[PDB]
Design an enzyme around this catalytic site. Structure first.
Site, PDB file in Angstrom:
ATOM      1  N   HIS A 198       0.832  -1.219   0.000  1.00  0.00           N
ATOM      2  CA  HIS A 198       0.000   0.000   0.000  1.00  0.00           C
ATOM      3  C   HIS A 198       0.862   1.264   0.000  1.00  0.00           C
ATOM      4  O   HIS A 198       0.552   2.226  -0.644  1.00  0.00           O
ATOM      5  CB  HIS A 198      -0.979   0.032   1.213  1.00  0.00           C
ATOM      6  CG  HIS A 198      -1.800  -1.178   1.321  1.00  0.00           C
ATOM      7  ND1 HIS A 198      -2.758  -1.472   0.365  1.00  0.00           N
ATOM      8  CD2 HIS A 198      -1.810  -2.134   2.269  1.00  0.00           C
ATOM      9  CE1 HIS A 198      -3.369  -2.582   0.725  1.00  0.00           C
ATOM     10  NE2 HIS A 198      -2.799  -3.052   1.887  1.00  0.00           N
ATOM     11  N   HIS A 229       5.152   6.857   7.044  1.00  0.00           N
ATOM     12  CA  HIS A 229       4.927   6.471   5.675  1.00  0.00           C
ATOM     13  C   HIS A 229       4.462   7.710   4.917  1.00  0.00           C
ATOM     14  O   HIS A 229       4.178   8.743   5.507  1.00  0.00           O
ATOM     15  CB  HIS A 229       3.912   5.326   5.556  1.00  0.00           C
ATOM     16  CG  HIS A 229       2.583   5.733   6.092  1.00  0.00           C
ATOM     17  ND1 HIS A 229       2.261   5.615   7.432  1.00  0.00           N
ATOM     18  CD2 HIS A 229       1.518   6.327   5.491  1.00  0.00           C
ATOM     19  CE1 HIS A 229       1.040   6.157   7.587  1.00  0.00           C
ATOM     20  NE2 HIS A 229       0.568   6.614   6.430  1.00  0.00           N
ATOM     21  N   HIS A 236       1.905   9.097   1.347  1.00  0.00           N
ATOM     22  CA  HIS A 236       0.928   8.923   0.266  1.00  0.00           C
ATOM     23  C   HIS A 236       1.354   9.859  -0.848  1.00  0.00           C
ATOM     24  O   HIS A 236       1.797  10.965  -0.564  1.00  0.00           O
ATOM     25  CB  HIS A 236      -0.496   9.252   0.754  1.00  0.00           C
ATOM     26  CG  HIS A 236      -0.911   8.518   1.967  1.00  0.00           C
ATOM     27  ND1 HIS A 236      -1.693   7.388   1.948  1.00  0.00           N
ATOM     28  CD2 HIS A 236      -0.623   8.703   3.282  1.00  0.00           C
ATOM     29  CE1 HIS A 236      -1.861   6.963   3.194  1.00  0.00           C
ATOM     30  NE2 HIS A 236      -1.213   7.735   4.043  1.00  0.00           N
ATOM     31  N   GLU A 257      -3.490  13.511   1.010  1.00  0.00           N
ATOM     32  CA  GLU A 257      -4.785  13.056   1.545  1.00  0.00           C
ATOM     33  C   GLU A 257      -5.574  14.274   2.029  1.00  0.00           C
ATOM     34  O   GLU A 257      -6.652  14.570   1.524  1.00  0.00           O
ATOM     35  CB  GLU A 257      -4.538  12.002   2.605  1.00  0.00           C
ATOM     36  CG  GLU A 257      -3.893  10.762   2.013  1.00  0.00           C
ATOM     37  CD  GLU A 257      -4.215   9.524   2.768  1.00  0.00           C
ATOM     38  OE1 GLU A 257      -3.971   9.468   3.989  1.00  0.00           O
ATOM     39  OE2 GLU A 257      -4.722   8.567   2.123  1.00  0.00           O
ATOM     40  N   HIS A 314       3.092  10.947   6.923  1.00  0.00           N
ATOM     41  CA  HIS A 314       2.372  10.632   8.161  1.00  0.00           C
ATOM     42  C   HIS A 314       3.318   9.992   9.165  1.00  0.00           C
ATOM     43  O   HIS A 314       3.811   8.891   8.911  1.00  0.00           O
ATOM     44  CB  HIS A 314       1.205   9.697   7.874  1.00  0.00           C
ATOM     45  CG  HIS A 314       0.100  10.339   7.106  1.00  0.00           C
ATOM     46  ND1 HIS A 314      -0.870   9.623   6.427  1.00  0.00           N
ATOM     47  CD2 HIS A 314      -0.163  11.659   6.947  1.00  0.00           C
ATOM     48  CE1 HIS A 314      -1.698  10.499   5.901  1.00  0.00           C
ATOM     49  NE2 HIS A 314      -1.288  11.775   6.183  1.00  0.00           N
ATOM     50  N   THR A 349      -6.695   6.587   7.612  1.00  0.00           N
ATOM     51  CA  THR A 349      -7.097   6.848   6.230  1.00  0.00           C
ATOM     52  C   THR A 349      -7.054   5.605   5.365  1.00  0.00           C
ATOM     53  O   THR A 349      -7.357   5.707   4.158  1.00  0.00           O
ATOM     54  CB  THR A 349      -6.290   7.965   5.575  1.00  0.00           C
ATOM     55  OG1 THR A 349      -4.962   7.463   5.351  1.00  0.00           O
ATOM     56  CG2 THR A 349      -6.288   9.245   6.377  1.00  0.00           C
ATOM     57  N   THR A 350      -6.706   4.452   5.936  1.00  0.00           N
ATOM     58  CA  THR A 350      -6.795   3.155   5.253  1.00  0.00           C
ATOM     59  C   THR A 350      -7.648   2.261   6.113  1.00  0.00           C
ATOM     60  O   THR A 350      -7.724   2.444   7.311  1.00  0.00           O
ATOM     61  CB  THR A 350      -5.458   2.454   5.023  1.00  0.00           C
ATOM     62  OG1 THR A 350      -4.926   2.017   6.276  1.00  0.00           O
ATOM     63  CG2 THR A 350      -4.451   3.334   4.350  1.00  0.00           C
TER      64      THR A 350
HETATM   65  C1  UII Z   1      -2.287  -1.938   6.785  1.00  0.00           C
HETATM   66  S1  UII Z   1      -1.411  -0.500   7.258  1.00  0.00           S
HETATM   67  O1  UII Z   1      -0.040  -0.827   7.521  1.00  0.00           O
HETATM   68  O2  UII Z   1      -1.698   0.499   6.251  1.00  0.00           O
HETATM   69  N1  UII Z   1      -2.027   0.079   8.696  1.00  0.00           N
HETATM   70  C2  UII Z   1      -1.391   1.048   9.661  1.00  0.00           C
HETATM   71  C3  UII Z   1      -1.952   2.466   9.595  1.00  0.00           C
HETATM   72  C4  UII Z   1      -2.862   2.791   8.612  1.00  0.00           C
HETATM   73  C5  UII Z   1      -3.127   4.102   8.297  1.00  0.00           C
HETATM   74  C6  UII Z   1      -2.465   5.119   8.972  1.00  0.00           C
HETATM   75  S2  UII Z   1      -2.750   6.791   8.494  1.00  0.00           S
HETATM   76  N2  UII Z   1      -2.678   6.846   6.918  1.00  0.00           N
HETATM   77  O3  UII Z   1      -4.094   7.107   8.935  1.00  0.00           O
HETATM   78  O4  UII Z   1      -1.663   7.539   9.086  1.00  0.00           O
HETATM   79  C7  UII Z   1      -1.699   4.812  10.060  1.00  0.00           C
HETATM   80  C8  UII Z   1      -1.443   3.484  10.373  1.00  0.00           C
HETATM   81  C9  UII Z   1      -3.475  -0.092   8.948  1.00  0.00           C
HETATM   82  C10 UII Z   1      -3.742  -0.611  10.344  1.00  0.00           C
HETATM   83  C11 UII Z   1      -3.926   0.249  11.420  1.00  0.00           C
HETATM   84  C12 UII Z   1      -4.371  -0.222  12.638  1.00  0.00           C
HETATM   85  C13 UII Z   1      -4.611  -1.568  12.825  1.00  0.00           C
HETATM   86  C14 UII Z   1      -4.305  -2.455  11.804  1.00  0.00           C
HETATM   87  N3  UII Z   1      -4.269  -3.814  12.003  1.00  0.00           N
HETATM   88  C15 UII Z   1      -4.381  -4.725  10.892  1.00  0.00           C
HETATM   89  C16 UII Z   1      -5.745  -4.534  10.267  1.00  0.00           C
HETATM   90  O5  UII Z   1      -6.850  -4.408  10.892  1.00  0.00           O
HETATM   91  O6  UII Z   1      -5.622  -4.522   8.948  1.00  0.00           O
HETATM   92  C17 UII Z   1      -3.911  -1.970  10.557  1.00  0.00           C
HETATM   93 ZN    ZN Z   2      -1.114   7.657   6.069  1.00  0.00          ZN
END
Ligand code: UII
Ligand code: ZN
EC number: 4.2.1.1
Length: 257
Positions: free
Chosen positions: A61, A91, A93, A103, A116, A195-196
């Site tokens: 991602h 990370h 975007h 974003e 972020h 945001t994901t």
């Molecule tokens: C899959 S990931 O690595 O993208 N991740 C981390 C994350 C996402 C987005 C932001 S942001 N853009 O808002 O700063 C910050 C951290 C999403 C995540 C966050 C919390 C829990 C889980 N656990 C596994 C599940 O439920 O998939 C996964």
């Molecule tokens: Zn992010």
């Protein structure tokens, strides 16, 4: 499973993650004329001198630069925050072209990318518990525009060839995230979400007003990453941003007059 394609992108996420249509989703457009100065915000404290980066990972991602969060080494405090938030990863975007990629937007302006820096509230003990709480995370967001190179970014750029595809990681020790900050810490803040997926409503957003400049060659290297795994069809990792969501019953506060 979810992604940023036409068939699995943000307009589809609500089918597996109904909170996508919730009351405090992120990102948002920051209307600079409607945001109000809040003289009560406490000063913002970014304490990254003891940060311990460990690894960089292409997760399919984005790429995450991961930190040791087993002690108070790199912390965010102050501003809108109560207590101490520990840095776990950062990370970005970014877009396929320089006119999109962020974003958050500012008066509907899209930046080329957004950084972020993700932190969790130490009162909840671990990240997984923190994301279940409305004040569990603090994400520091920084806009990127294309212009002069960012020297402190180049170590990140140069490792990306080694993590081209999903599931690849590399050692990434001794990286100093202070080299990614702008000069001013003036910010906007509001309550929002990841945001994901899973889109959990657990984030205090802190979005810096001053963008950092990166070079066209630096962002071009981001756009050579792949969403796919090794030996699978190449799909360039570009346009990995969620568009702005409805503000609903929220107020964006400014730290600055
Ligand atoms: C899959 S990931 O690595 O993208 N991740 C981390 C994350 C996402 C987005 C932001 S942001 N853009 O808002 O700063 C910050 C951290 C999403 C995540 C966050 C919390 C829990 C889980 N656990 C596994 C599940 O439920 O998939 C996964
Ligand atoms: Zn992010």
């Amino acid at each position: 499973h979810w992604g940023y394609g036409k068939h699995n992108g943000p307009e589809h996420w609500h089918k597996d993650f109904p909170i996508a249509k919730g009351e405090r989703q992120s990102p948002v457009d920051i209307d600079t004329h409607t945001a109000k100065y809040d003289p009560s915000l406490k000063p913002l404290s970014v304490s990254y001198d003891q940060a311990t980066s460990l690894r960089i990972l292409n997760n399919g991602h984005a790429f995450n630069v991961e930190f040791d969060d087993s002690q108070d080494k790199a912390v965010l405090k102050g501003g809108p925050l109560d207590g101490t938030y520990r840095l776990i990863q950062f990370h970005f975007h970014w877009g396929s072209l320089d006119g999109q990629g962020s974003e958050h937007t500012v008066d509907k302006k899209k930046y080329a990318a957004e950084l972020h820096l993700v932190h969790w509230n130490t009162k909840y003990g671990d990240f997984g518990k923190a994301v279940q709480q409305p004040d569990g995370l603090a994400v520091l967001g920084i806009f990127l525009k294309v212009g002069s190179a960012k020297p402190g970014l180049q170590k990140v750029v140069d490792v990306l060839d080694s993590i081209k595809t999903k599931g690849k990681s590399a050692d990434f020790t001794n990286f100093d995230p202070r080299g990614l900050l702008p000069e001013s810490l003036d910010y906007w803040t509001y309550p929002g979400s990841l945001t994901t997926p899973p889109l959990l409503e657990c984030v205090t957003w802190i979005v810096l007003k001053e963008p950092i400049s990166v070079s066209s060659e630096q962002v071009l290297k981001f756009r050579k990453l792949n969403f796919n795994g090794e030996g699978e069809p190449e799909e360039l990792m570009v346009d990995n941003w969620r568009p702005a969501q409805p503000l609903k019953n929220r107020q964006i506060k400014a730290s600055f007059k």
